[PDB]
């Protein structure tokens, strides 16, 4: 029987650090590859790096594999993270006589947080350009092991953080959103600081 | 119209199309959110012959009955299980690695009446964040839309932008005890103070929704929600 077992669900790592990515597998094959993909949000899975069974640890720029034949272990590092690492990475076997089926695991999402060297953590209101009374609040400029707390309200929605790359300027930033439909809603307390 | 976004009512069907050229065996795969990608079945056009995994019924997925076309992939009698990025995908001729196309994303929902649109709305940039940072984030707002098949993208002066922006990477559930929840996704575009200070500059926000076709009857009262692009925009000002 073939298994593939991606333990970890997902891992955050700072901009130029390194990640490692488990991958567990059972397989009664003699000789066999383990592939690992990248899958992004426009839903594409592109091949990164493949690990023969009777092969040196396998090394593709920033990839890297470490194979432990007999642990049944074939962990991807990638190296010097930049943002456009975040995706979902799945590792996959494949039996190689008779190339056929691959056998994937769960995918282990990674998220690249920018190193914010100078923080600004702050709190605006944002009027609505055609309504003005309709409003939304931004949290900007915080640093990355900031932890953006949860909506513990039904009626007011907190999204996850993202960063943009104001990239004219060498300036990254991360930001969250919160949003409610109530007049009783206060950018300060929204955020929970 | 994009193929890579289907939204069918439960019963239907679908054909998904495979975007990579066939010579060898083309291999289908079903990524469920959560779940491994797993192969439900693969064709030779040149053989005219199917091989299915096991567990599936041989009436679910349909390859024939195309007037005079390579082999399909039409699934039949679709339950909201069949939810789904499909993919298609071939072993490379050096058989060093398996290609992978495009997914095709498929939504099968209970009625199509739980299709809606998004509002769109700008808000533009605080004037403190203006008079501290000399910057001036402005954020999109799409809400009350499904399913979650959108491409929020900003326009600057009639121009697609690609810096100074971050989407959500995931919508969030508006009711999300719901199950058939509408959705909400919100977006920043950050520029210079004095950018965003001059009233000449136009900014605008817009959402393609992948909706309903021309096909679709559905039975509702308000605007067919087909797939469109929804925009709101906001000029600069200096005060």
Not at chain 1, 164 to 176: G, I
């Amino acid at each position: 029987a073939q298994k593939v077992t991606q333990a970890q669900s997902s891992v955050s790592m700072p901009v130029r650090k390194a990640v490692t990515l488990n991958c567990l597998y059972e397989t009664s094959w003699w000789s066999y590859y383990i592939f690992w993909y990248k899958q992004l949000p426009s839903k594409e899975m592109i091949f990164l790096i493949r690990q023969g069974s009777d092969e040196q640890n396998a090394k593709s720029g920033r990839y890297s594999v470490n194979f432990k034949k007999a642990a049944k272990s074939v962990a991807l590092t990638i190296s010097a993270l930049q943002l456009e690492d975040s995706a979902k990475y799945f590792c996959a076997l494949g039996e190689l006589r008779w190339p056929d089926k691959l056998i994937f695991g769960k995918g282990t999402r990674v998220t690249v947080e920018p190193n914010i060297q100078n923080p600004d953590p702050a709190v605006y209101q944002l009027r609505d350009s055609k309504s003005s009374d309709k409003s939304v609040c931004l949290f900007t400029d915080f640093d990355s092991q900031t932890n953006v707390s949860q909506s513990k309200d039904s009626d007011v929605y907190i999204t996850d953080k993202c960063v943009l790359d104001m990239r004219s300027m060498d300036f990254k930033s991360n930001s969250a959103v919160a949003w409610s439909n109530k007049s009783d809603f206060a950018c300060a307390n929204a955020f929970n600081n | 119209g994009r193929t890579k976004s289907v939204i069918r009512q439960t019963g239907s069907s679908a054909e998904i199309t495979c975007d990579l050229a066939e010579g060898g065996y083309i291999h289908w795969y079903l990524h469920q959110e959560g779940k491994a990608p797993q192969r439900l079945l693969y064709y030779d056009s040149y053989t005219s012959s199917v091989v299915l995994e096991s567990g599936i019924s041989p009436g679910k997925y349909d390859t024939y009955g195309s007037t005079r076309k390579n082999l399909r992939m039409i699934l039949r009698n679709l339950i909201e299980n069949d939810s789904g990025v499909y993919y298609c995908a071939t072993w490379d001729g050096d058989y060093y690695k398996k290609l992978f196309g495009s997914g095709t994303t498929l939504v099968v929902t209970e009625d199509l009446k739980n299709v809606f649109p998004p509002e769109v709305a700008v808000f533009e940039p605080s004037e403190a964040e203006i008079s501290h940072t000399q910057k001036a984030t402005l954020v999109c707002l799409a809400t009350g839309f499904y399913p979650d098949h959108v491409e929020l993208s900003w326009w600057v002066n009639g121009k697609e932008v690609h810096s100074g922006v971050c989407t959500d990477p995931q919508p969030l559930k508006e009711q999300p005890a719901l199950n058939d929840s509408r959705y909400a996704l919100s977006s920043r575009l950050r520029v210079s103070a004095t950018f965003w200070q001059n009233p000449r500059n136009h900014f605008r926000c817009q959402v393609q929704f992948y909706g309903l076709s021309e096909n679709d009857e559905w039975t509702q009262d308000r605007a067919k929600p087909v797939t469109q692009i929804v925009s709101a925009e906001a000029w600069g000002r200096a005060d």
